[PDB]
Amino acid sequence: MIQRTPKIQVYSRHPAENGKSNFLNCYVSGFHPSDIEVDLLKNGERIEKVEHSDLSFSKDWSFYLLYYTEFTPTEKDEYACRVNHVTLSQPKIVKWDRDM
Amino acid sequence: GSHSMRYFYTAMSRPGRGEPRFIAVGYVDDTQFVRFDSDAASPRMAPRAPWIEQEGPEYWDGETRNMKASAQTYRENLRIALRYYNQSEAGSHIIQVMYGCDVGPDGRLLRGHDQSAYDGKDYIALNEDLSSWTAADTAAQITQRKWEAARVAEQLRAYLEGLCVEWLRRYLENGKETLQRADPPKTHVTHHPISDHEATLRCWALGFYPAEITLTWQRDGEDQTQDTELVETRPAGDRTFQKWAAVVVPSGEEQRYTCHVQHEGLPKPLTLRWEP
Amino acid sequence: LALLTGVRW
């Protein structure tokens, strides 16, 4: 059968301001089948309190999920989203770019 | 304006790991309001929006009974599909369904929907007439013959024209403060030099609802469709959505570019530019 | 309000 690799966007709910509380989002979409593994990373380490949306899909049947956690961005700290899927040989890591 | 209600079912087999998982979610426009997960500690139709919470125990018990029966039906359909496609019991497969109604300002049915997929490919679909079917392959034609014999299309039509419309209108009234409220995008243009000879202009739209939006770049009044990078519209997490569009421009020609924004919450389409 | 599913594939 056919398989589709996930698209990945990492971003904040509100425009980032250092020292101000926010929400870090990882939006995964366009993938098939539905089994997927997603972690939010802080300086390479796994964040524990991460929640996610109920599984749903687009008109082309591809699935999407929002993963998110509360965070306070700083100048030094680096955040990332790490995704694994059957279409991926190794976990893909996308770093949070505050201007994207 | 116009509104929609939509239900999405996902049924996923997993040999060696118990019975197929069944997940159902319900939406009004771009607002999720219910969910069901057969893998939950205690599976029930559960509220995901505040305005549905006022429905009583008869509603929730009724919807829960239905979802449990539905899960059983689609577990059976997964077994049937194996026979239709000459597949073994060892593999994992997925059935998806998506159905619902659209109503116009006057609350009348604009059109109904009921479409199914197998392993991410079109399987069978109720036509816009709500009386006939489109089958995607010879397996779905078997299902079509069964559903024609049992006059299934008539049952769907009765639901799409009746209950679906009536309950959508009910939800629209109970959640009118949010469901019938459009939030316009907050927009601005950012500028990032790539080199001495090029710069990126990025047109941002933030905090809008519903998700439907159009962002286009024009150069000298001409659409730059094939040269624009457009990210997928994404949820912010607070019900609203985000999107941006970017174009790479020659340094010194920034002012020849204009961003055009169309959204239901705006009285007129917006035109903006980079303001240094 | 969800549809009642009756007939199988």
Short mmCIF file of C-alpha atoms in Angstrom, two decimals:
data_model
loop_
_atom_site.label_atom_id
_atom_site.label_comp_id
_atom_site.label_asym_id
_atom_site.label_seq_id
_atom_site.Cartn_x
_atom_site.Cartn_y
_atom_site.Cartn_z
CA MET A 1 0.00 0.00 0.00
CA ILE A 2 0.96 3.67 -0.06
CA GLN A 3 2.62 5.65 2.72
CA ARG A 4 3.09 9.41 3.15
CA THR A 5 5.81 11.06 5.23
CA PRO A 6 4.80 13.72 7.78
CA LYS A 7 5.26 17.45 7.25
CA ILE A 8 6.60 19.16 10.37
CA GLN A 9 6.16 22.69 11.69
CA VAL A 10 7.63 23.91 15.00
CA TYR A 11 6.41 27.26 16.29
CA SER A 12 4.97 29.20 19.24
CA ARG A 13 1.33 30.13 19.92
CA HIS A 14 2.24 33.78 20.47
CA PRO A 15 5.21 35.75 19.07
CA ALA A 16 8.25 34.82 21.15
CA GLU A 17 9.42 37.22 23.85
CA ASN A 18 12.24 35.99 26.10
CA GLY A 19 11.18 35.58 29.72
CA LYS A 20 7.49 35.51 28.82
CA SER A 21 5.44 32.31 29.11
CA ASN A 22 4.17 30.81 25.86
CA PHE A 23 3.21 27.53 24.18
CA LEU A 24 5.59 25.50 22.03
CA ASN A 25 3.79 23.74 19.16
CA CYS A 26 4.76 20.83 16.93
CA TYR A 27 2.25 20.33 14.12
CA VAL A 28 2.62 17.09 12.19
CA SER A 29 0.46 16.58 9.10
CA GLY A 30 0.04 14.97 5.69
CA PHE A 31 1.09 11.53 6.92
CA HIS A 32 -0.19 7.99 6.43
CA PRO A 33 -0.55 5.57 8.14
CA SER A 34 -1.53 7.01 11.53
CA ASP A 35 1.09 5.56 13.89
CA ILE A 36 3.57 8.29 14.76
CA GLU A 37 6.00 9.12 17.57
CA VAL A 38 6.56 12.74 18.58
CA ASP A 39 8.78 14.27 21.27
CA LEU A 40 9.37 17.89 22.20
CA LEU A 41 12.99 18.55 23.16
CA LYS A 42 14.64 21.17 25.36
CA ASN A 43 18.40 21.32 24.82
CA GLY A 44 18.33 17.78 23.43
CA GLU A 45 16.35 16.43 26.37
CA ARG A 46 12.77 15.14 26.29
CA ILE A 47 10.01 17.32 27.76
CA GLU A 48 7.58 15.37 29.96
CA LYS A 49 4.34 17.38 30.15
CA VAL A 50 3.56 17.31 26.40
CA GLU A 51 -0.11 17.05 25.34
CA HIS A 52 -1.61 16.38 21.91
CA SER A 53 -4.84 16.70 19.92
CA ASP A 54 -7.31 13.96 19.01
CA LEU A 55 -6.39 12.12 15.80
CA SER A 56 -8.07 13.56 12.71
CA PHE A 57 -7.44 13.82 8.98
CA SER A 58 -7.68 16.07 5.92
CA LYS A 59 -9.86 15.73 2.80
CA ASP A 60 -7.07 13.73 1.15
CA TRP A 61 -7.21 11.26 4.10
CA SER A 62 -3.81 12.28 5.47
CA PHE A 63 -3.63 12.54 9.27
CA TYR A 64 -2.69 15.50 11.45
CA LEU A 65 -1.84 16.06 15.13
CA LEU A 66 -0.85 19.04 17.25
CA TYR A 67 1.68 18.43 20.05
CA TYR A 68 2.20 21.25 22.54
CA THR A 69 3.74 22.22 25.86
CA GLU A 70 3.89 25.36 27.99
CA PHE A 71 7.32 27.00 27.99
CA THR A 72 9.25 30.20 28.66
CA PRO A 73 11.70 30.97 25.84
CA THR A 74 15.16 32.26 26.74
CA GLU A 75 18.18 33.47 24.77
CA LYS A 76 20.22 30.31 25.38
CA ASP A 77 17.70 27.44 25.47
CA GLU A 78 17.13 25.54 22.23
CA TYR A 79 13.87 23.72 21.51
CA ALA A 80 13.14 21.02 18.94
CA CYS A 81 10.59 18.51 17.75
CA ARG A 82 11.64 14.90 17.11
CA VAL A 83 9.42 12.77 14.87
CA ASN A 84 9.49 9.10 13.92
CA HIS A 85 7.27 7.40 11.34
CA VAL A 86 7.33 4.18 9.31
CA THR A 87 8.34 6.32 6.32
CA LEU A 88 11.45 7.47 8.22
CA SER A 89 14.63 5.41 8.55
CA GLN A 90 15.78 7.56 11.45
CA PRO A 91 14.00 10.12 13.67
CA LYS A 92 13.75 13.55 12.04
CA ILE A 93 14.64 16.51 14.25
CA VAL A 94 13.32 19.98 13.45
CA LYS A 95 14.66 22.87 15.53
CA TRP A 96 12.39 25.70 16.64
CA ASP A 97 13.04 28.78 14.51
CA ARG A 98 11.35 31.72 16.23
CA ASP A 99 10.89 33.51 12.89
CA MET A 100 9.11 30.65 11.11
CA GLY B 1 -22.41 32.86 6.66
CA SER B 2 -22.45 29.17 5.77
CA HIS B 3 -21.55 26.41 8.22
CA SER B 4 -20.70 22.73 8.29
CA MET B 5 -20.84 19.73 10.58
CA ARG B 6 -18.47 16.82 10.01
CA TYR B 7 -17.69 13.49 11.68
CA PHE B 8 -14.41 11.66 11.10
CA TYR B 9 -13.90 7.95 11.88
CA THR B 10 -10.57 6.13 11.89
CA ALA B 11 -10.47 2.34 12.32
CA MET B 12 -7.01 0.77 12.50
CA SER B 13 -6.22 -2.95 12.72
CA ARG B 14 -3.12 -4.13 14.57
CA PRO B 15 -2.65 -7.93 14.47
CA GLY B 16 -1.04 -9.32 17.61
CA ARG B 17 -1.93 -6.15 19.52
CA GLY B 18 -5.62 -6.64 20.27
CA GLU B 19 -8.72 -5.48 18.40
CA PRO B 20 -8.75 -2.60 15.90
CA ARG B 21 -8.62 0.88 17.41
CA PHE B 22 -11.63 3.09 16.65
CA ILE B 23 -11.36 6.89 16.98
CA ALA B 24 -14.18 9.32 16.16
CA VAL B 25 -14.15 13.12 16.31
CA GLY B 26 -16.84 15.69 15.52
CA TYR B 27 -16.43 19.21 14.16
CA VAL B 28 -18.53 22.28 13.55
CA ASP B 29 -16.61 24.30 10.98
CA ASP B 30 -13.04 24.31 12.37
CA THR B 31 -14.09 23.64 15.97
CA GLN B 32 -13.85 20.12 17.41
CA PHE B 33 -16.68 19.43 19.87
CA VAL B 34 -16.71 15.66 20.60
CA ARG B 35 -14.37 12.68 20.63
CA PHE B 36 -14.47 8.91 21.13
CA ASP B 37 -11.45 6.60 21.53
CA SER B 38 -11.92 2.86 21.99
CA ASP B 39 -8.45 2.77 23.61
CA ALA B 40 -9.43 5.16 26.42
CA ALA B 41 -9.57 3.73 29.95
CA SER B 42 -13.34 4.24 29.83
CA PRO B 43 -14.53 4.83 26.21
CA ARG B 44 -17.36 7.35 25.88
CA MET B 45 -18.35 10.22 23.62
CA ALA B 46 -16.74 13.15 25.45
CA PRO B 47 -17.08 16.97 25.14
CA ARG B 48 -14.26 18.95 23.53
CA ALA B 49 -16.05 22.32 23.40
CA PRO B 50 -17.81 24.17 26.27
CA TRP B 51 -21.12 24.72 24.45
CA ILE B 52 -21.77 20.98 23.95
CA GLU B 53 -21.53 20.43 27.71
CA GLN B 54 -25.08 21.64 28.27
CA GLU B 55 -26.46 18.52 26.51
CA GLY B 56 -27.99 16.06 28.96
CA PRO B 57 -27.28 12.42 29.95
CA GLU B 58 -29.66 11.12 27.26
CA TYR B 59 -27.52 12.82 24.61
CA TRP B 60 -24.19 11.47 25.90
CA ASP B 61 -25.50 7.97 26.59
CA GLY B 62 -27.08 7.88 23.14
CA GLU B 63 -23.90 9.03 21.42
CA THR B 64 -21.77 6.59 23.42
CA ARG B 65 -24.01 3.62 22.56
CA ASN B 66 -23.77 4.62 18.89
CA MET B 67 -19.97 4.92 18.91
CA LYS B 68 -19.56 1.51 20.54
CA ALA B 69 -21.83 -0.08 17.92
CA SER B 70 -19.98 1.83 15.19
CA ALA B 71 -16.60 0.55 16.43
CA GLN B 72 -17.93 -3.01 16.17
CA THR B 73 -19.27 -2.38 12.66
CA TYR B 74 -15.96 -1.01 11.37
CA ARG B 75 -14.02 -3.85 12.98
CA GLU B 76 -16.22 -6.13 10.87
CA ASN B 77 -15.66 -3.95 7.80
CA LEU B 78 -11.89 -4.31 8.26
CA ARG B 79 -12.30 -8.11 8.11
CA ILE B 80 -14.53 -7.85 5.04
CA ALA B 81 -11.98 -5.60 3.31
CA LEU B 82 -9.34 -8.32 3.72
CA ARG B 83 -11.49 -10.66 1.64
CA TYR B 84 -12.22 -7.98 -0.97
CA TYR B 85 -8.52 -7.34 -1.56
CA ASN B 86 -7.11 -10.86 -1.08
CA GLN B 87 -5.11 -9.76 1.97
CA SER B 88 -3.79 -11.77 4.92
CA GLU B 89 -4.70 -11.42 8.60
CA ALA B 90 -1.11 -10.47 9.48
CA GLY B 91 -1.04 -6.89 8.17
CA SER B 92 -2.27 -3.60 9.63
CA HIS B 93 -4.89 -1.66 7.66
CA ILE B 94 -7.02 1.47 8.07
CA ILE B 95 -10.57 2.45 7.21
CA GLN B 96 -11.50 6.14 7.27
CA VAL B 97 -14.91 7.79 6.97
CA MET B 98 -15.98 11.39 6.74
CA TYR B 99 -19.58 12.57 6.57
CA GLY B 100 -21.76 15.58 7.33
CA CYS B 101 -23.83 18.52 6.11
CA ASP B 102 -23.32 22.12 4.99
CA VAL B 103 -26.00 24.74 5.63
CA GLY B 104 -26.38 28.24 4.24
CA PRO B 105 -27.25 31.46 6.14
CA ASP B 106 -30.93 30.48 6.16
CA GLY B 107 -30.04 27.12 7.72
CA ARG B 108 -31.13 25.04 4.73
CA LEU B 109 -29.07 22.10 3.44
CA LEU B 110 -26.56 23.24 0.83
CA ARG B 111 -25.16 19.74 0.35
CA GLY B 112 -24.43 16.47 2.14
CA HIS B 113 -21.33 14.26 2.31
CA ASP B 114 -20.46 10.63 3.08
CA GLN B 115 -17.13 9.30 1.85
CA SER B 116 -14.96 6.31 2.86
CA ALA B 117 -11.35 5.26 2.28
CA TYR B 118 -9.28 2.08 2.63
CA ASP B 119 -5.56 2.37 3.41
CA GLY B 120 -5.61 6.06 2.47
CA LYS B 121 -7.27 5.59 -0.92
CA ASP B 122 -10.79 6.47 -2.05
CA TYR B 123 -13.11 3.50 -1.54
CA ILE B 124 -16.76 4.54 -1.93
CA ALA B 125 -18.59 7.90 -1.90
CA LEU B 126 -22.19 9.06 -1.74
CA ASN B 127 -22.81 11.30 -4.76
CA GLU B 128 -24.10 14.86 -4.36
CA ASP B 129 -27.62 13.66 -5.33
CA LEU B 130 -27.64 11.63 -2.08
CA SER B 131 -29.21 8.79 -4.08
CA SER B 132 -26.31 7.09 -5.89
CA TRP B 133 -22.72 5.96 -5.24
CA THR B 134 -19.24 6.33 -6.72
CA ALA B 135 -17.07 3.23 -6.20
CA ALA B 136 -13.32 3.60 -6.75
CA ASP B 137 -12.50 -0.03 -7.66
CA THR B 138 -13.99 -3.50 -8.15
CA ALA B 139 -13.98 -4.16 -4.40
CA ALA B 140 -16.02 -1.05 -3.65
CA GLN B 141 -18.42 -2.09 -6.43
CA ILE B 142 -19.28 -5.13 -4.31
CA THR B 143 -20.17 -2.83 -1.40
CA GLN B 144 -22.11 -0.59 -3.81
CA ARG B 145 -24.29 -3.51 -4.96
CA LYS B 146 -25.03 -4.38 -1.32
CA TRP B 147 -25.92 -0.80 -0.42
CA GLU B 148 -28.11 -0.40 -3.51
CA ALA B 149 -30.01 -3.55 -2.55
CA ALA B 150 -30.51 -2.37 1.05
CA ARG B 151 -31.30 1.20 -0.09
CA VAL B 152 -28.63 2.68 2.19
CA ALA B 153 -28.50 5.97 0.27
CA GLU B 154 -32.09 6.66 1.32
CA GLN B 155 -31.16 6.29 4.99
CA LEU B 156 -28.20 8.66 4.59
CA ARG B 157 -30.34 11.19 2.75
CA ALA B 158 -32.86 11.08 5.60
CA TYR B 159 -30.08 11.84 8.09
CA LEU B 160 -28.29 14.48 6.01
CA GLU B 161 -31.53 16.33 5.23
CA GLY B 162 -33.02 15.88 8.70
CA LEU B 163 -31.13 15.28 11.95
CA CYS B 164 -27.76 16.49 10.65
CA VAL B 165 -29.19 19.87 9.66
CA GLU B 166 -31.41 20.19 12.73
CA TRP B 167 -28.62 19.45 15.21
CA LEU B 168 -26.09 21.64 13.41
CA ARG B 169 -28.51 24.57 13.76
CA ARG B 170 -28.91 23.67 17.44
CA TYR B 171 -25.14 23.71 17.98
CA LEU B 172 -24.83 27.01 16.09
CA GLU B 173 -27.33 28.62 18.48
CA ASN B 174 -25.80 27.20 21.69
CA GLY B 175 -22.26 28.14 20.63
CA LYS B 176 -23.14 31.36 18.81
CA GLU B 177 -20.64 33.50 20.73
CA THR B 178 -17.79 31.52 19.15
CA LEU B 179 -19.12 29.46 16.24
CA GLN B 180 -20.82 32.47 14.63
CA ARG B 181 -17.86 34.78 15.27
CA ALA B 182 -15.08 35.32 12.75
CA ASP B 183 -11.72 36.60 14.01
CA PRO B 184 -9.79 38.54 11.35
CA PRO B 185 -6.07 37.93 10.87
CA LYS B 186 -3.47 40.17 12.47
CA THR B 187 -1.07 40.86 9.61
CA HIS B 188 2.44 42.21 9.06
CA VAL B 189 5.39 41.86 6.69
CA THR B 190 8.89 40.91 7.83
CA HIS B 191 12.13 41.43 5.93
CA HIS B 192 15.21 39.21 6.14
CA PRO B 193 18.32 39.74 3.98
CA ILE B 194 19.58 36.52 2.38
CA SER B 195 22.66 38.10 0.83
CA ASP B 196 23.73 41.50 -0.49
CA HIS B 197 21.60 40.93 -3.59
CA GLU B 198 18.47 39.21 -2.20
CA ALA B 199 15.97 39.47 0.63
CA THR B 200 13.05 37.40 1.91
CA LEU B 201 9.70 39.11 2.41
CA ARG B 202 7.34 37.13 4.63
CA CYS B 203 3.67 38.02 4.94
CA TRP B 204 2.19 36.86 8.27
CA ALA B 205 -1.42 36.16 9.25
CA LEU B 206 -2.02 35.40 12.93
CA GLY B 207 -4.94 34.68 15.26
CA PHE B 208 -7.65 34.12 12.65
CA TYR B 209 -10.79 31.96 12.66
CA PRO B 210 -12.01 30.13 10.67
CA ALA B 211 -8.96 28.56 8.99
CA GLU B 212 -9.94 29.42 5.41
CA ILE B 213 -7.68 32.23 4.23
CA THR B 214 -5.87 33.41 1.11
CA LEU B 215 -2.40 34.99 1.15
CA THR B 216 -0.85 36.06 -2.16
CA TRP B 217 2.22 38.06 -3.19
CA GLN B 218 2.08 40.43 -6.15
CA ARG B 219 5.08 41.88 -7.98
CA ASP B 220 4.16 44.99 -9.98
CA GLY B 221 0.52 43.94 -9.61
CA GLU B 222 1.11 40.44 -10.98
CA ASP B 223 0.47 37.30 -8.89
CA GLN B 224 3.66 35.44 -7.98
CA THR B 225 2.02 32.05 -7.49
CA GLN B 226 4.84 29.85 -8.79
CA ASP B 227 7.50 31.80 -6.86
CA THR B 228 5.79 32.02 -3.45
CA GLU B 229 6.53 29.68 -0.54
CA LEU B 230 3.29 28.96 1.30
CA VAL B 231 3.24 27.02 4.57
CA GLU B 232 0.25 24.90 5.52
CA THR B 233 -2.28 26.72 7.70
CA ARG B 234 -1.56 25.64 11.28
CA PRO B 235 -3.48 25.68 14.59
CA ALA B 236 -2.20 28.05 17.28
CA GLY B 237 -3.81 26.02 20.07
CA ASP B 238 -6.31 28.65 21.25
CA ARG B 239 -8.88 27.86 18.48
CA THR B 240 -7.20 30.28 16.02
CA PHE B 241 -4.84 29.65 13.11
CA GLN B 242 -1.59 30.91 11.60
CA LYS B 243 -0.17 31.13 8.06
CA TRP B 244 2.62 32.87 6.19
CA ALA B 245 3.68 33.40 2.58
CA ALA B 246 7.22 34.24 1.50
CA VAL B 247 8.97 35.45 -1.64
CA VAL B 248 12.64 36.04 -2.42
CA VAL B 249 13.15 39.48 -3.94
CA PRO B 250 16.04 41.47 -5.44
CA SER B 251 17.49 43.92 -2.92
CA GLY B 252 16.16 47.40 -3.66
CA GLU B 253 12.92 46.17 -5.28
CA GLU B 254 11.08 45.44 -2.01
CA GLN B 255 8.53 48.18 -2.62
CA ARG B 256 7.37 46.59 -5.88
CA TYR B 257 5.88 43.75 -3.80
CA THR B 258 2.46 43.77 -2.12
CA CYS B 259 0.78 41.13 0.06
CA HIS B 260 -2.94 40.53 -0.38
CA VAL B 261 -5.05 39.00 2.37
CA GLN B 262 -8.58 37.60 2.10
CA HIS B 263 -10.52 36.37 5.12
CA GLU B 264 -14.18 36.14 6.18
CA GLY B 265 -13.49 38.36 9.20
CA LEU B 266 -12.23 41.25 7.06
CA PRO B 267 -14.78 43.69 5.57
CA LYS B 268 -12.52 44.11 2.53
CA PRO B 269 -9.40 42.29 1.30
CA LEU B 270 -6.19 43.76 2.75
CA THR B 271 -3.14 45.00 0.87
CA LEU B 272 0.11 45.47 2.77
CA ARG B 273 3.81 46.05 2.14
CA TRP B 274 7.10 45.99 4.01
CA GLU B 275 7.37 49.12 6.16
CA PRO B 276 11.09 49.67 6.92
CA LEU C 1 -25.39 14.31 16.43
CA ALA C 2 -23.77 11.29 14.80
CA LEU C 3 -25.19 9.02 12.12
CA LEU C 4 -26.31 5.50 13.06
CA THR C 5 -24.24 2.95 11.10
CA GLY C 6 -26.27 -0.06 10.00
CA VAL C 7 -25.06 -2.00 6.99
CA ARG C 8 -21.54 -3.40 6.63
CA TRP C 9 -19.22 -3.22 3.62
#
